[PDB]
A = this chain, B = another copy of it.
């Protein structure tokens, strides 16, 4: 796209503020930003806020979201679809033109770990170029295992294809399949979907801890066979809904856009890989590490 040549828009922080007991404002950009998805491989990603996946959004069950998209793409329209919300797609997930903003309002009345993404046709194009992320809606009543959890992180799986190539996006195998982590609390890592960062800078935990991961597989196209090496999931809540409660799972099948809360105990010091067990994907990047130490 001639108007994206040489474009590399610096990442912009997510803006969020609570405006009432049940109402939140969120402001995101659509922007075009170079991301290093594998060593020496730059992808001029279509993004929210210069991250791909986009920035983590966390709201409470029952919060109405008043969402603004500021479209910094000089020539492509963009839009936002939160899977968390009840909305009219044809009124509320509509396009925002280059250099314009739009504001849309809709309720998040279901707990869980939801994909969000650009909803502009062709949606496959906008997602595959980078316009995906997660919104967590925290359950009013928690999870029944909350008191057991020592530490928590967010991990998101996505694929990367040949650049902006619709034939590849539709018909081709992924070039890379990757994990990223998005921060929940100060100090947590906040990374993009790449083949290396979570190997070189593993997530951290302590021996004996029960870990919760909020996970989503945003695709665009593949399903995920999510597994942590050296443990078993003690508890799993499909889509992060507390009702959908499995136990003792070695691996969690996630559809494209599928989420989960998963919990597991790390009993011994060491480095624990986190994989999709579809090992062709793992080979192509989708292995993160969790380093577990006595401190």
| A contact residues vs B (CB 8 Å cutoff) | 81, 83-93, 110-112, 114-115, 119, 122-124, 127-128, 166, 169-171, 173, 219-227, 229-232, 238-239, 241, 243-244, 246-259, 265, 267-273, 276-284, 292
**Bound CA span A90–B269, Å:** 9
What chain B residues lie within 8 Å of A223 (beta carbons)?
223, 225, 253, 255, 278
Q: Are A86 and B267 in contact (CB under 8 A)?
A: yes
Q: Which residues of B contact A257 (CB under 8 A)?
A: 225, 227, 250-251, 277
- The 9 A-B residue pairs whose C-beta atoms are closest, nearest first, are A88-B270, A225-B255, A241-B248, A88-B268, A253-B255, A90-B270, A225-B256, A124-B279, A257-B277
Q: A221-B281, A223-B225, A241-B247 are in contact. List 18 more A-B contacts (CB 8 A).
A: A83-B250, A86-B230, A86-B267, A87-B267, A88-B230, A89-B272, A91-B268, A92-B230, A110-B248, A122-B283, A124-B280, A169-B280, A220-B278, A223-B253, A227-B257, A239-B251, A241-B246, A253-B254
* A262 CB to nearest chain B CB (Å): 13
Sample of 27 A–B contacts (CB below 8 Å): A83-B227, A83-B251, A84-B232, A84-B250, A86-B232, A86-B265, A89-B271, A90-B270, A92-B230, A92-B270, A93-B229, A110-B232, A112-B248, A112-B250, A123-B279, A166-B283, A169-B280, A170-B280, A219-B225, A220-B279, A239-B249, A244-B247, A251-B256, A253-B258, A256-B277, A256-B279, A257-B277
Q: How many copies does the complex hold?
A: 3
- Is A277 a contact partner of B87 (Cβ separation < 8 A)? no
- Nearest CB of chain B from residue A292's CB, rounded to whole Å: 7
Q: With A239-B249, A241-B248, A255-B252 in contact, do A280 and B91 touch (Cβ < 8 Å)?
A: no
Residues of B within 8 A of A219 (CB): 225, 277-279
Q: What chain B residues lie within 8 Å of A267 (beta carbons)?
A: 86-88
CB-defined contacts of A222 to chain B, threshold 8 Å = 278
> In the complex the two chains form, is A282's CB within 8 Å of B123's CB?
yes
